[PDB]
Design a protein around this ligand. Sequence first.
Ligand SMILES: CCc1ccccc1-c1ccc(CNCCc2nc3c(OC)cccc3[nH]2)cc1Cl
Ligand SMILES: CCc1ccccc1-c1ccc(CNCCc2nc3c(OC)cccc3[nH]2)cc1Cl
Lengths: 324, 326
Amino acid sequence: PVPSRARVYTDVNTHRPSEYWDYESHVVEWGNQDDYQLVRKLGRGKYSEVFEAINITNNEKVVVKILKPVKKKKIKREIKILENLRGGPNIITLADIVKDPVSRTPALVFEHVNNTDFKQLYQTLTDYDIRFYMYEILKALDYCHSMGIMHRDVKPHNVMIDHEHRKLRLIDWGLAEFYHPGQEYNVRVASRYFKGPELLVDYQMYDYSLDMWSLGCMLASMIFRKEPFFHGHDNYDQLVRIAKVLGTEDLYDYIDKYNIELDPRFNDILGRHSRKRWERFVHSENQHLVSPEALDFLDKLLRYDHQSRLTAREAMEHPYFYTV
Amino acid sequence: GPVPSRARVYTDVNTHRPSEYWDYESHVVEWGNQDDYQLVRKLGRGKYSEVFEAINITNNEKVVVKILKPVKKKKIKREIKILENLRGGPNIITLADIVKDPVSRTPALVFEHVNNTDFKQLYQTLTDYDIRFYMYEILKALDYCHSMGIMHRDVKPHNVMIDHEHRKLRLIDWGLAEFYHPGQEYNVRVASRYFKGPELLVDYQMYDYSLDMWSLGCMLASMIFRKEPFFHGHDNYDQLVRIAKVLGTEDLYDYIDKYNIELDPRFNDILGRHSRKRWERFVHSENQHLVSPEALDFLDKLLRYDHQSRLTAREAMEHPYFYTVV
Ligand SMILES: CCc1ccccc1-c1ccc(CNCCc2nc3c(OC)cccc3[nH]2)cc1Cl
Ligand SMILES: CCc1ccccc1-c1ccc(CNCCc2nc3c(OC)cccc3[nH]2)cc1Cl
């Protein structure tokens, strides 16, 4: 395959000392979990359980994420990334790294986030709300991208919102990675519905632009009230669902531009598909969230070619955000 | 008999944890194959151990290998359980593996690599800031292990490794460490002579984490006054006399009366009568650049006969002497 590099923040890690991006060499100091009392279970991941807790030393609520130790380098990577991004705009704030004296299970302690119900907001959300929160996610992305990191798991489950205080946090940095130009990354990241075409066609030299595809999948689901927007039933079928919207002509132009070899599993399922107009997805239920600006912005995110997608900084200057 | 005593901090941390945590005699040790490590050179010694620099052949990473002279089986079990309990704690030497050479079958412990700076010729370069910085780092290690219900019981310069280039410090040799249980009577034949607390010298067995804070105070006094060691005893009885020549004998009697301690008759002809000295008496041209009112107030609050009156590691961390550190 033809090599590729990010259009923005290409060399941000190249120009930094090894200690910043060398997570395997980073030394983790695990404090005593005795300072925290677990209150209740909040959420759950495939390799984590998230609890609400109280810090007994200051009577402040915190969030404790207990990690299922499956891979050691993976825990070190998330911690390093969290330490590098600690305090960044709309990034979940790592407050402590602790282990329970008896269990010795890795646990991460974060700033408390007061989650407003996802299904309660969904119908009462306005056109303004979507632009407001889209801009807040973009602040988090432009920032982590500038810090040489790609989240690689951008989805609604990984965005916590406290609608009362108009506060948003991008969470679960467990799949996050450091961007290095020319590096070949594992394509088994993100959650099926949010996987970029680069992942589905096994193109490893991807970059920050992967997060912009995932962001486009989120916006499409919100403005059209269609969740998920691209409803694949497996990773191969996922590309077919994308192809039913973007068409198969542009998919072949994409794979030819990067000299990508299409997996034979696609042979009997891909078919032939016309490129659809974004206006076809507008209906009575969703028309109050759709505008020419929203559709133009969406069109500029949901592109096969990872290089042709808007960067987080270009996205922030789009007319869709002129009112925020 | 003697009046009972208990720690002011972390008193019941082991009482409220299951058997599993502190019952080291019941802990099962999994000894891996030492074939993954090649010994490079001898770094140091211990009366019960030899410490080497080694290379892990599987990842080309340097490690530290401590080979234990099997004197007591429960003792190896205790050190391993404590190291596993503290594994990953701040400024604690990190146990990476537990191995046995296939032929020798000798217990060996594998740790994270620590790059020791030659403490020699660099004591003269050390600044007031460096002492405060490194003292704070040791306090992080102590508050953590005490919070985990462990007393180190051998705090001294030899057991603190410093990589000055990276400003990295590790508290090592947990071979004398013990689990703290309130009301437990411990063996007083612990620590190294110059660092032994008065509780050990007067054979007061119901001691606690505060023993480590006395040893820390001996280290601080030696560094700030450039007097190594600060309390230079020639035997364990003479050690108490050396302390008494500084702290005075009036406060020593108040200490032994508070705990109804019986003073050994061996002290009768050597203890004498000693006035309590001002810490300012130890300031000279060679060390005045390391001494300040804050340092002397902090030292005074560590070097107390009464183990209960000494600062805890958490109280020490909040002292004005540390207001200038990160
Ligand atoms: C107007 C915002 C928006 C714009 C476009 C697309 C989607 C949304 C959106 C819609 C809903 C949500 C809310 N997601 C909450 C997910 C969440 N993850 C959690 C969790 O993870 C461990 C634990 C406990 C609670 C948790 N809550 C987030 C977002 Cl970003
Ligand atoms: C005088 C005490 C003091 C007071 C305040 C601040 C610093 C010091 C100090 C000053 C120097 C050192 C250096 N200690 C070296 C310890 C060491 N232990 C080793 C070892 O043990 C087996 C093997 C090989 C090398 C080893 N090096 C440690 C310390 Cl803690």
